[PDB]
Design a protein around this motif. Structure first.
Motif, short mmCIF file in Angstrom:
data_model
loop_
_atom_site.label_atom_id
_atom_site.label_comp_id
_atom_site.label_asym_id
_atom_site.label_seq_id
_atom_site.Cartn_x
_atom_site.Cartn_y
_atom_site.Cartn_z
N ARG A 43 0.74 -1.23 -0.01
CA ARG A 43 0.10 -0.12 -0.08
C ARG A 43 0.87 1.32 0.21
NH1 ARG A 43 -4.74 1.78 4.47
NH2 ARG A 43 -5.50 3.56 3.58
N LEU A 44 0.60 2.20 -0.93
CA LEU A 44 1.63 3.03 -1.13
C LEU A 44 0.93 4.53 -1.53
CD1 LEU A 44 4.58 3.91 -1.65
CD2 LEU A 44 4.50 3.20 -4.05
N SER A 45 1.30 5.56 -1.03
CA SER A 45 0.61 7.12 -1.59
C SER A 45 0.97 7.30 -2.78
CB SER A 45 1.27 7.97 -0.37
OG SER A 45 0.46 9.12 -0.71
N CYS A 46 0.03 8.26 -3.20
CA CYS A 46 0.32 9.04 -4.74
C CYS A 46 1.15 9.94 -4.65
CB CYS A 46 -1.07 9.39 -5.42
SG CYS A 46 -2.16 8.10 -5.33
N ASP A 47 1.56 10.44 -3.45
CA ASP A 47 2.50 11.63 -3.17
C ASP A 47 4.13 11.16 -3.37
OD1 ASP A 47 0.28 13.71 -3.27
OD2 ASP A 47 0.09 13.43 -0.96
N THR A 48 4.36 9.74 -3.07
CA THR A 48 5.57 9.47 -3.23
C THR A 48 6.46 9.75 -4.57
OG1 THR A 48 7.13 7.67 -2.57
CG2 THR A 48 4.97 7.12 -3.74
N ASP A 49 7.77 9.44 -4.57
CA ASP A 49 8.33 9.90 -5.77
C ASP A 49 8.43 8.72 -6.52
OD1 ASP A 49 9.87 8.63 -3.81
OD2 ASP A 49 11.64 9.82 -4.29
N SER A 50 9.24 8.68 -7.79
CA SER A 50 9.53 7.48 -8.60
C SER A 50 10.89 7.02 -8.18
CB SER A 50 9.17 7.93 -9.83
OG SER A 50 8.00 8.26 -10.20
#
Length: 45
Positions: free
Chosen positions: A11-18
């Protein structure tokens, strides 16, 4: 965090980087690619 049984999910947020996603997926998990194929659907109920 965790594995799935009935398979590593997250589960990961949309605001994280790539970039550190790539570092996590390459260094901890499996290796790189010569090719990368993308198929888009998802409305196919």
């Amino acid at each position: 965090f965790g594995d799935i049984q009935f398979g590593k999910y997250l589960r990961l947020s949309c605001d994280t980087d790539s970039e550190t996603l790539y570092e996590l997926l390459t260094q901890h998990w499996h290796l790189k690619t010569p090719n990368l194929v993308i198929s888009v659907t998802g409305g196919a109920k």
